[PDB]
Amino acid sequence: VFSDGYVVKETIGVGSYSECKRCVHKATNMEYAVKVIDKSKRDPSEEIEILLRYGQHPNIITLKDVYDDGKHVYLVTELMRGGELLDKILRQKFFSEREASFVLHTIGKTVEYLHSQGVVHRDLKPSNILYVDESGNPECLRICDFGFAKQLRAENGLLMTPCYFVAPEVLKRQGYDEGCDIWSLGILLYTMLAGYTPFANGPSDTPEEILTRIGSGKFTLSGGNWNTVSETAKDLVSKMLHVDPHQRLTAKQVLQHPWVTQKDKLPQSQLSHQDLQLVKGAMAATYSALNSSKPTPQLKPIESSILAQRRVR
Amino acid sequence: VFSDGYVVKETIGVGSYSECKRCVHKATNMEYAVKVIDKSKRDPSEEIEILLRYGQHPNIITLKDVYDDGKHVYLVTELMRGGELLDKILRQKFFSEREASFVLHTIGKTVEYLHSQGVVHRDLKPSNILYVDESGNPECLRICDFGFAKQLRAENGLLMTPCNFVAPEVLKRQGYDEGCDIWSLGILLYTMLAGYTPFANGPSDTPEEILTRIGSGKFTLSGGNWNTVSETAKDLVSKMLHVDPHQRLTAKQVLQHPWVTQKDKLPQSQLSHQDLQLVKGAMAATYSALNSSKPTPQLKPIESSILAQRRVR
Amino acid sequence: AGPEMVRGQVFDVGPRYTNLSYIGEGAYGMVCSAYDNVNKVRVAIKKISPFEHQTYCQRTLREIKILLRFRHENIIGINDIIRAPTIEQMKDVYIVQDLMETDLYKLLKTQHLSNDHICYFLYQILRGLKYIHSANVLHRDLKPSNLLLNTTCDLKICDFGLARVADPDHGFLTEYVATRWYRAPEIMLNSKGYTKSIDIWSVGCILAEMLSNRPIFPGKHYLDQLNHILGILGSPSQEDLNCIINLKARNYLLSLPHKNKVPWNRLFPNADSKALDLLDKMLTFNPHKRIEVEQALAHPYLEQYYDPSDEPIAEAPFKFDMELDDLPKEKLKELIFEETARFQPGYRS
Amino acid sequence: GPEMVRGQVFDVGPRYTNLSYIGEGAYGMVCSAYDNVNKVRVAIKKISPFEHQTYCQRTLREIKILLRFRHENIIGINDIIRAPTIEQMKDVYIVQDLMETDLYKLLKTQHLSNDHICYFLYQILRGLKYIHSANVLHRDLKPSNLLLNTTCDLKICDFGLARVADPDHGFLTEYVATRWYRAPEIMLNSKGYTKSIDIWSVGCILAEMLSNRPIFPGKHYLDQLNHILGILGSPSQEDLNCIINLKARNYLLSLPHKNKVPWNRLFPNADSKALDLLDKMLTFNPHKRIEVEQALAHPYLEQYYDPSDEPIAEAPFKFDMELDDLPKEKLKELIFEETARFQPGYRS
Ligand SMILES: Nc1ncnc2c1ncn2[C@@H]1O[C@H](COP(=O)(O)OP(=O)(O)NP(=O)(O)O)[C@@H](O)[C@H]1O
Ligand SMILES: Nc1ncnc2c1ncn2[C@@H]1O[C@H](COP(=O)(O)OP(=O)(O)NP(=O)(O)O)[C@@H](O)[C@H]1O
Ligand code: NA
Ligand code: NA
Secondary structure (H helix, E strand, O other): OOOOOEEEEEEEEEEOOEEEEEEEEOOOOEEEEEEEEEOOOOOOHHHHHHHHHHOOOOOEOOEEEEEEOOOEEEEEEEOOOOOEHHHHHOOOOOOOHHHHHHHHHHHHHHHHHHHHOOEEOOOOOHHHEEEOOOOOOHHHEEEOOOOOOEEOEOOOOOEOOOOOOOOHHHHHHHHHHHHHHHHHHHHHHHHHHHOOOOOOOOOOOOHHHHHHHHHHOOOOOOOHHHHOOOHHHHHHHHHHOOOOHHHOOOHHHHHHOHHHHOHHHOOOOOOOOOOHHHHHHHHHHHHHHHHOOOOOOOOOOHHHOHHHHHHOO | OOOOOEEEEEEEEEEOOEEEEEEEEOOOOEEEEEEEEEOOOOOOHHHHHHHHHHOOOOOEOOEEEEEEOOOEEEEEEEOOOOEEHHHHHOOOOOOOHHHHHHHHHHHHHHHHHHHHOOEEOOOOOHHHEEEOOOOOOHHHEEEOOOOOOEEOEOOOOOEOOOOOOOOHHHHHHHHHHHHHHHHHHHHHHHHHHHOOOOOOOOOOOOHHHHHHHHHHOOOOOOOHHHHOOOHHHHHHHHHHOOOOOOOOOOHHHHHHOHHHHOHHHOOOOOOOOOOHHHHHHHHHHHHHHHHOOOOOOOOOOHHHOHHHHHHOO | OOOOEEOOEEOOOOOOEEEEEEEEEOOOOEEEEEEEOOOOEEEEEEEEOOOOOHHHHHHHHHHHHHHHHOOOOOEOOOOEEEOOOOOOOOOOEEEEEEOOOEEHHHHHHHOOOOHHHHHHHHHHHHHHHHHHHHOOEEOOOOOHHHEEEOOOOOEEEOOOOOOEEOOOOOOOOOOOOOOOOOOOHHHHOOOOOOOOHHHHHHHHHHHHHHHHOOOOOOOOOHHHHHHHHHHHHOOOOHHHHOOOOOOHHHHHHHHOOOOOOOOHHHHOOOOOHHHHHHHHHHOOOOOOOOOOHHHHHOOHHHOOOOOHHHOOOOOOOOOOOOOOOOOOHHHHHHHHHHHHHHHOOOOOO | OOOEEOOEEOOOOOOEEEEEEEEEOOOOEEEEEEEOOOOEEEEEEEEOOOOOHHHHHHHHHHHHHHHHOOOOOEOOOOEEEOOOOOOOOOOEEEEEEOOOEEHHHHHHHOOOOHHHHHHHHHHHHHHHHHHHHOOEEOOOOOHHHEEEOOOOOEEEOOOOOOEEOOOOOOOOOOOOOOOOOOOHHHHOOOOOOOOHHHHHHHHHHHHHHHHOOOOOOOOOHHHHHHHHHHHHOOOOHHHHOOOOOOHHHHHHHHOOOOOOOOHHHHOOOOOHHHHHHHHHHOOOOOOOOOOHHHHHOOHHHOOOOOHHHOOOOOOOOOOOOOOOOOOHHHHHHHHHHHOHHHOOOOOO
16 A cells, blocks of 8 residues: 555554554565554644654654655554553563653653753653563653654744744743643653552543542542652652642653652562553543543534624515 | 845855855844755755754754755754864864864764764765864764765665665675775874874875875874874774774774773873864865766767767768 | 633633633633623633733734724624733733634634635625725734634634734734744735735635635745745736836746646636635735725625625724834833723723 | 775786776676786676575576677676685676766766767667567666767666566565666556566656656655656556556556646657657556567667667577576576686686
């Protein structure tokens, strides 16, 4: 459908006007992921440029080729063989604050890198963080799915970083988006520590009650793992998950927190967890609740308009 | 000529079918360089993709925007206001092995990075290494002018790193080009340590003389600064400037050499140098001689061909 | 409790306005819906914070003064304005308006418009624009995102921050906007003698977009936009070229390769032919030949709604107290403070 | 010791000395060298193919075919150097007449007069007539393997991908430096290839001579095909269903309609007779594509056309057996045997 140089295999993911299939590059027998995007429904330009410029980072999914048949664009990327982050660490035999810190450190550095380049991810769900293989090495982690990511630019397109002008609401929005990225790292951190998600008890939770929990910014920090979880970890999650983005840490500030820097002096005790499918269910319900909005009403006939009425006499 | 959002200033560089001008982005009042390329004479696609993918590296010139008016392409990049590396160094009141080593280390890491990505620069002359500002800080160094650079790819365009997979002469040419990059860093290193060019004494040197010196691999490591220059530096320069690319170091090996890994403890004693224009003239003569080809003969009339002679009458 | 906060943005509009809900944002303001506890209805509130920059203060003063003066069915009104009791305390301004249900941008991303709705929306845009132009004012920034709509199909133009009093022999240069795709070619070529015709071009771009759910002349750079425009309209005729001042654009245009006109029915094969006829007249390269707002309304495409007796005009030309362009931001702040005083508690006229 | 060119050893002494770099492809490096026996400079290509079956195929195909063929417009092989024992053989050096340049390098440095374009095309087709008469497909014609002297003599080289014609029967995954001269049926993988694929390449080459630009470039086959269709227009229904499979046949059907761009709008200043022949060489449908003998008789070539001096092979070419499934170890034996005749002491 795009190249006779690849063998296309099974679907490994589905997104918004997109789907991902594992494929084998015949000449080298190397495996890749190919993400097909319907260009008539979803302009992939921004995602492509962001992957082009920043995908060379070790912990960002690398863009190896692009095909365009007119209607569809096809992104050939590195294949994540190791599955999603939580599917690994909540199942693996040993997991403690030490490993969780290494995880937040690798992902944190990568998010700091993006933000410093004027890129916000905006869809930083744990399910979009994958391992490239089965080693469990934090270095093998990759941030994926930049379908919603945005690059800051000047009035005439010039590539811009928040460091060294843009309209004022545009800047506040970049700050808000950076805060949302950090808040998603906070959700990930909470879940790694607690073994469950902070604002949902499971997939059967309603969007209404998840949102009220999120809005109040209340979450449990006692019982279960929390009894033996270090105080410096508790402090950090409370600041990442904070209600107002004002008191919410930057990526840089996360990497400076003692729980991250002093990863040596961290407990190595085993951490419990809820059943994986429940955790994934609660996670999806939480992001579903966050990104949902009441469908908008349909247009009425023209004759519903008083002005239009005056014209039909 | 490409945007009313910039004020175009003086020409600051000239290349093959290209010209570079300093420009000021009005909205932000920030200065930039814009490289105009006539694409009817020179396809800039390769250069652009390489800058897009790799220009995020701190010591590679960053590509901030691209204009295309159909006939010309305009690359908007950081302005190198610190000027060329050697112009800066040989105009300094003070210069030492320690500074020289910090220069090599920074550039070497960048070349190592490029090569590991399957990129060879192929025109790594000292004059293509600039400072972004006046500080003389090694991290302000930028490799520039990727006009000749090449990315390794598979048979169907798939982005390749050198880590079979590609046809054999293509691989040999990669290795050869990598060696040419390292040899060019060896020139730079020799010149920084000696205060003059290894294979030329000045712009008055004949191309024939420079080439036979290059082909014999002969260069002085005595007299001048060499009496007090570290032996470990002498060894490094020898191996970088070696006749056969087989016994020549890789970028990674340069960075692993004692003279680079011990850069913090190298002598700070004054290194002497010859006159700047003499040395630059000698440097240009060296590369001219290296890159010069005997112009090819013009075609003769068709009637110079024996087959054609048979076809007339 | 305390001041409600929307997306990290404090909205200090209580106690009159409560239960805030995010509804949108531009490059300069954030807009929420809120409950008016005095009038017992939900309203729209835009927060702007312009006082650190002259150009942002211009946007704020221009919008406030023009909208407070204008009265028209197809132009958003301003019902209330909130800011601090003293000028030193004033960092934010909140503009309170009728809550419209959506805008044309959002609508076009969620659905297609019927041929009839396109016609009627276009009619209302031009009806509102007729009033604006009759007040000797140029909007200068018409786009789908600032055409507000209710599902009853009522349309109101908003977003008057770039609006100026007409004056050919006399505000875009380097000012950030979220989109430039609705700007006339003469603006991109920097011809600099802009007239009411620039608004008509924007409306043209908007009509073409309603017809296809795609911008007709997108592009990252003016170079790309212009090339998209020429790629459809064709190379400008000699007569159009020497209707242009300067020379630098002329010669660039003359430097360009020839491009033929693409027939509108090839671009939009299924559009009403009368819609395409009006589109051709609005999307005219030469601004002097571009159709005018009163002629546009009288075009056969809009015949069902055309009624000059119910297409009102302003009583008089609009004027600022003085030209704003060279006023320091400190002075502009005073003018904004004074213009907003009438909505302060205890204010007397 | 042995001379070294660009890091590569060229062990061809003592007969060949004073080596100088003249070029390379994806598989070989080529130098000029002085032949101390015949007292002239020659071209020498070094290949090192023995670690892979497909590289061995290229080597054996080119050596066997070129040693057999005898034609003015086809490069000959004068000598072959390799190690005296099969276990020591890692490299093969193919020695040929030194040509001054190739069409690729030429088009980078100058324009061609309308008359030279005509004569160069004539020679391409004259050589190709011989190849096709031998029942052989070159399969990889491109500017870089059309060798030229400044006397305007042209010679086809680079026969590593050449095969004996057999429609009802080696591109897949094989690295080449450029795919821009490949026929559409190759890109659509119609897999019933005939002599007509070579005619397509020549048409692409003729267009490039007329404009100093490749007519159908592209990173991917998708791109190349869209460039082709964007010029020739969407294939007719008659042409469309002249194709096996459906997977290919369905895709062009899915594609939106494109009109034919007249050749004089693409090349407004080209000789009209050149464009008429170009049209016939660059037809989408392989069955309707002009054949080499017909091409030679086309009015554009009238000044050079002479069937009495356009010789053909005496007989179809045949390898000893089909090469495709032969392990690289066997292919090496065959390359050793084919090159034995050039060894010192050899008797036949
Ligand atoms: N009265 C309203 N009712 C409903 N939505 C509104 C209302 N006013 C504005 N909006 C929405 O909020 C968005 C921004 O308003 P706008 O007045 O354009 O902001 P601005 O940032 O000052 N200028 P701009 O950058 O041109 O959008 C609009 O595009 C609408 O979606
Ligand atoms: N006999 C010759 N005389 C002069 N130049 C030659 C000669 N043979 C080859 N060349 C040049 O060397 C280049 C490579 O030759 P070639 O035989 O095509 O190499 P290959 O790598 O085995 N195949 P390819 O990848 O298709 O180029 C040519 O394109 C010519 O420029
Ligand atoms: Na004004
Ligand atoms: Na064969």
